[PDB]
Design a protein around this nucleic acid. Structure first.
Lengths: 534, 465, 465
RNA sequence: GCCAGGGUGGCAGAGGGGCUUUGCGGCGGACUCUAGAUCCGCUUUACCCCGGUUCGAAUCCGGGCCCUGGC
């Protein structure tokens, strides 16, 4: 609570220590779900893929290369210009852009369309045989709220969504029509186009890079490839070039991601767009790899490719100077960096059920169901703790005054009792805490047997009694509304959280299960709380 | 050059300043093409699209949303699952994936489609976590999309960047969608916000939740467009229909805000034509600074010997004063030997009445607003000299080196005398200076011009025996 | 080299692959010191302290806290205003600012002091906003501080970096201080947290709020220290006493969390000695990779002519096969003319019984774990060749160039014959190869070693007439 | 791509022309119980896609994918 700067200052100026110990008045008395870890801050988290893409950008920029956006969708004519003959071999592993035509409301489906009851479903409205032609002319998506909500009456799409379904079975015959447009397999396809417009107008050497998407087709399998991937690519345009330049770049580039040693082999493919005997395969050794559940135990992994563009394809775009091209594949580099083994599990994790809450996050989700509402009750429970926490080994029966005060304007006095005998006031597991560990919620007592759980897991700080106390603290305040005179709340054995006042939102509950987690909250809690609210 | 600690150490004990000035000895002597600005470092430069994208990731992260990558290639059955009965209207604007049939030609379209907007993949991604993770769920993703809207190039393009995000809680107003827009949009300058319900009323958005955010950015007021009032529609958002969520088993509602990147990118870096922005390499838009054009202007033939340098260095040293004396009139500038034989340098305007050096001996080359000029430093050209990048290379300077290296060719050719002369200056070659053939095709492309003209009228005779 | 679009364009119309292979013609021919890895790009590298600092700024920003710069130089009257009666105990560990008195010698201390911790400046900064801005106020700042703790160097230093933050609300528990620690600390790997009340009970923190955060980081378990259990005290925090706030007019409480940077920096990049981290330039810690040492190993004298290259290039081409034939025995390798006169190259071991080339003609130079070795590629050295960076320069290779350039000196010296010979290899000069004098002082400093020894036993005679 | 054994419900794992395991777990209900057990009730009658044979196939034949003992 806010205090008075003056007062606290004119009192401390004379008597300090007295003002000090007084500070405690400004703190806040938090209820039960107002304490750590029941309260916390949240922060956003990046995705390994996008992360690496960023690192990758900087990396490049840090070595001279300037950023650029290349043509993604291109006419396969370009590919056939970059492979001459071996072109087809590629276009098989590429994707073509197909697209739905328009409802041919003429000729073929027109003659036989004019030999039946043109229209029965009363709609009238002058022959809009032109408002339908402007469709076979040039329409789109946001154009339906024109030939309905402004044509045959009826708001937006309340009748337009079915008028085009019942009276127009036509639409349900459209079929996407392939074309010559393609989704570039690799970056290179677009480089020729872009380098085309500037290979000789800007000063040499030219250093350009671009980390963007590319689409490929390789045995429709999420495992053995993905339809789309990222390719951190670059091009080096200069008068004189050698495969060395390809290495020098590959080095300086990888070196900013750990890799400490590189080896370059000559690629067998010997692709057409690259000069003969320049398509190199670059291998880099990175520590994080040494000895792993992978095939790169020795640390070495092939991380990129590169070569010089054949003065052939270059001419196909009238590029006079030779050009170096390195092509780091992102997804891998990301796995190595962020430690993932399965491409698909890394990039698309939510889908592969790779979600996970932490011990601490689960502990934070375990709230207290029945919790007081009046400053009094907060003390009633706080107190029920004292007497029940101390007089735990009292050969029952036996009452014990816990609280003495006025609640809501009525004399209140609650006691901690026990009915049976030959036992103790409170059961043995009265001081059992809820510790989350290895993903399972537990209701155990501190021991030399449970250590592993209190030093590795994360304790919730709530003990059965601490949980119950709050339940009782509620009942008593209830009677303070029903103006009764005697409430004796009692709890026997514990089988779950419910039998402890604790609970967790349904979603965290489902998580636990989905994750093969386990909740274990049982034990003799036994401890009734007879109240005498006059 | 590497000096000696001790030597200089002790040398400083006697007379300090005599040793201090002694320091100038370690400084390297620079040739003409070795000093600023004919030498300079370089560095990468990011693209405004991408920059804005990263700038958007942080923005999102800064308001709590964690990143995720959504499906890009999808079976249209999804668009259908979401839009309900409006699904077909949409499938029009979307692309489809077609492949070539293996000839054991003509692409065979398939059921796959490139997402027309993030929302297509959202339902798919939220399907696996919506009821397993603790609420609220705040996810976002800035990735590529594919629309066919008229299949245009001018107005819009085939692929854009969506700056999407989704909020999954038990209770959601249209307000959460309002807050998220301001928090996100404010981190870019936008000061005032206005929302208007969208007429499109897309069927995947609970009826009457779909809104359109209008933001005010002072960077716009006065703009050469209809965004002068400062406001611009910058993003849309709505709340997913239970009809669609149900289709994927999402029990709780979901707020979805979408940000049109290329637009923001434009607002930020101030481009008018998206294409001229996202794709300037093609749309002729390419620039070099005057400072850059400058650096590229270099001395062609330059003295290849230690002496050669101190030769032309003198040639000028005299013209810088005797470029007056009524011609004819001869002056001596150098006295020494190179390679093996003694040498002397002469400078005179053999011709009749006039001055020794032409009226352009003191013309400096400077680049300005894209053109390469050859002009005298007169109180008339000031602005060219105070807004451009003066090469530092003057007519006589450009000339000298030519001679100082030309006599150097006779000195090794056994010859005894050479008469290097120079009258007018039709261009640069005439002033002994060049620019890589590429900056040249550049100047022209950027329809700039080179005006290096001038009556140098200066000849140099040298005798080596 | 720049080719001709058309030429190659048409050339491809006839036989494609014949034109494709024709492409290899544009590739530049590289000299010995021009190819990898004797040529490579470089790039800046940030310091772990700073990195961590930036990494901390974002972390803070990511949990909502806005940045601010606090006063650094201050009148001790503040330390006093805050610590109440304990104020002097503190003033001990703090520094004071002293200046020189203008002689119209002996510094004159003053009342100014360099802050011992952020908190000193916090009260000052919060003084102006605590009651004017809307709550909650969340500020943070990662700046420099000055402590005198024993005035040591080993254990601690004179200046450290505090990663402070303050939370100003009407109601604050010790909990807010707990949450902020986890949110902040988690973004670095810390998984489990443990807090323990601090005994120090500093008087500026409400009695019994001052805590000490203990965080668990898997990156530690197994560490060669007492942080093996994985946990480490990583930060402290408390809630400002009304006694202190009052002194500055702050009505509402304030939570303050402090993060010891140099420590975090260490945990992250794994340094053990703070000084060896923050100040490695001094503490001898400086490294070069084998790949770097490599690049620095270059051919000293190399063929300065087009032919020269194809000469040594042949010299080796023969030794690569005739390094067997029982000596004496002579072979011819080159046939052509350079500069003006025809030339032929001879290779023979004039001496009696043995082989032509010594047993070290095929020794490649490789760098490994810091040493520069000269070794044969035998199934015995593998690991050196598969964990190090092989120069690619072999004994004969290193040699050749020497000769191919040595006959080049006779070819221009008018001479008629030269006999370049070579027996043992006591080091690199002997193999015609060098390393900048600085990498040399390096190898030694990093007490590494160079073992380039070997019986080359190969001589080359050449006759030009 | 090549010989052969196989691709069964939340998990494990026998059989297998149509009726058909079982154990573990969870789900719901009940218990005089001071300790982490007790009993009763329970799913989506589970066995990949397209064809063939049959009255009918998860159980029989071919093609497409998935794990291998192997090249």
């Amino acid at each position: 609570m806010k205090f008075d700067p003056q007062k606290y200052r004119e009192l401390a100026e004379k008597d300090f220590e007295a003002a000090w110990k007084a500070g405690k008045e400004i703190l806040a008395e938090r209820s039960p779900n107002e304490l750590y870890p029941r309260v916390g801050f949240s922060f956003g988290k990046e995705h390994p893929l996008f992360a690496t893409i960023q690192r990758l950008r900087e990396a490049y920029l840090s070595i001279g290369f300037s950023e650029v956006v290349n043509p993604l969708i291109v006419e396969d004519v370009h590919v056939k210009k970059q492979f001459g003959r071996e072109a087809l071999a590629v276009l098989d592993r590429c994707f073509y852009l197909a697209t739905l035509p328009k409802p041919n409301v003429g000729i073929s489906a027109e003659k036989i369309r004019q030999i039946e009851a043109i229209t029965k479903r009363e709609v009238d409205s002058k022959p809009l045989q032109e408002i339908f032609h402007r469709y076979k002319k040039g329409e789109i998506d946001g154009d339906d709220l024109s030939y309905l909500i402004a044509e045959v009456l009826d708001v937006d799409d309340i009748t337009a969504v079915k008028i085009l379904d019942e009276v127009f079975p036509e639409f349900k015959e459209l079929k996407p029509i392939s074309s010559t447009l393609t989704l570039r397999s690799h970056m290179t396809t677009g480089w020729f186009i872009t380098l085309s417009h500037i290979a000789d107008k800007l000063p040499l050497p030219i250093k350009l890079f671009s980390i963007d998407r590319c689409f490929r087709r390789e045995q429709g399998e999420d495992a053995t490839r993905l339809y789309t991937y990222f390719s951190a690519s670059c091009v080096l345009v200069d008068e004189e070039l050698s495969v060395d330049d390809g290495k020098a770049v590959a080095e300086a580039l990888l070196r900013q991601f750990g890799f400490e040693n590189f080896r370059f082999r000559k690629d067998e493919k010997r692709s057409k767009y690259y000069i003969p005997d320049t398509q190199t395969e670059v291998f880099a050794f990175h520590p994080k790899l040494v000895g792993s559940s992978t095939k790169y135990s020795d640390g070495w992994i092939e991380i990129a490719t590169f070569g010089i563009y054949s003065p052939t394809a270059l001419a196909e775009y009238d590029i006079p100077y030779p050009v170096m091209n390195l092509g780091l594949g992102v997804e891998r580099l990301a796995m190595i960096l962020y430690g993932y083994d399965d491409v698909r599990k890394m990039v698309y994790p939510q889908i592969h059920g790779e979600i996970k809450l932490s011990d601490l996050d689960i502990a934070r989700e375990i709230k207290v169901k029945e919790v007081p509402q009046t400053a009094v009750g907060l003390k009633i429970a706080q107190s029920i703790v004292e007497t029940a926490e101390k007089h735990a080994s009292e050969p029952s029966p036996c009452s014990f005054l816990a609280f003495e005060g006025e609640m809501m304007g009525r004399n209140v006095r609650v006691y901690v009792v026990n009915e049976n005998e030959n036992t103790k006031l409170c059961g043995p597991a009265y001081a059992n805490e809820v510790v989350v560990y290895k993903g399972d919620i537990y209701g155990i007592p501190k021991t030399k047997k449970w250590r592993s759980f209190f030093e590795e897991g994360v304790p919730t700080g709530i003990r059965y009694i601490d949980g119950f106390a709050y339940y009782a603290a509620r009942k008593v305040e209830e009677a303070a509304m029903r103006e009764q005179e005697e409430v004796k709340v009692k709890a026997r054995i514990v089988e779950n959280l419910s039998d402890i006042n604790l609970y967790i939102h349904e979603n965290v509950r489902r998580y636990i299960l989905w994750k093969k987690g386990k909740i274990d909250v049982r034990g003799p809690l036994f401890v009734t709380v007879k109240a005498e609210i006059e």
